[PDB]
Amino acid sequence: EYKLVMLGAGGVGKSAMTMQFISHRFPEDHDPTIEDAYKIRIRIDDEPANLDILDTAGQYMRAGEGFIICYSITDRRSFHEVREFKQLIYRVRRTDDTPVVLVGNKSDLKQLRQVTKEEGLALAREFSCPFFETSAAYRYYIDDVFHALVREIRRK
Ligand SMILES: Nc1nc2c(ncn2[C@@H]2O[C@H](COP(=O)(O)OP(=O)(O)O)[C@@H](O)[C@H]2O)c(=O)[nH]1
Ligand SMILES: [Mg+2]
Numbered sequence: 001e002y003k004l005v006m007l008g009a010g011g012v013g014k015s016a017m018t019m020q021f022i023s024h025r026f027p028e029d030h031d032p033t034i035e036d037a038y039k040i041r042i043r044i045d046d047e048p049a050n051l052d053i054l055d056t057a058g059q060y061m062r063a064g065e066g067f068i069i070c071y072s073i074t075d076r077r078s079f080h081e082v083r084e085f086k087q088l089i090y091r092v093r094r095t096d097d098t099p100v101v102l103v104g105n106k107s108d109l110k111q112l113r114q115v116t117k118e119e120g121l122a123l124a125r126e127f128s129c130p131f132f133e134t135s136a137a138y139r140y141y142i143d144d145v146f147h148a149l150v151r152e153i154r155r156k
Contacts, residue, residue, distance in 0.1 A: 001050040007085040008070035009078035010058040013105035016136035066099040073104040099152035108135035
């Protein structure tokens, strides 16, 4: 039983992601102030588990064992902001190497990318971190992210 925290600028898809993950549903635009927390049972490689995800609105962060930091490939400011999210996990859980998974959401808005995939991969080498592009819109790559976060909780 593992508690994970989604971190990210407003509007990048933390919510659409968490909900595509937990119940295979996209919310087109969801009350943005609602920081939800969603307990679910899943099965990871199988060795199967329970995760309590805090979906943040961009202090249950003392107790958080894992972070998904999220940006939108369409929004460089969101991406630069992953670096403030970074030094928050550190001021808080307190080292240089918490379990962390870096994600660029909205990969489906490819005509509108302001952020390259090698940029994301290079921020991920900073954290030493797995890195993913997802589209929550189309549930693309969404399981992989949460399952990799789980494998860094347990590899640490
Ligand atoms: N095209 C597209 N839109 C998305 C995706 N994920 C989220 N959105 C849209 O982006 C907005 C914010 O989603 P949301 O999950 O609520 O962002 P949050 O503020 O991080 O929690 C809404 O207008 C969503 O429909 C995506 O993968 N693709
Ligand atoms: Mg939200």
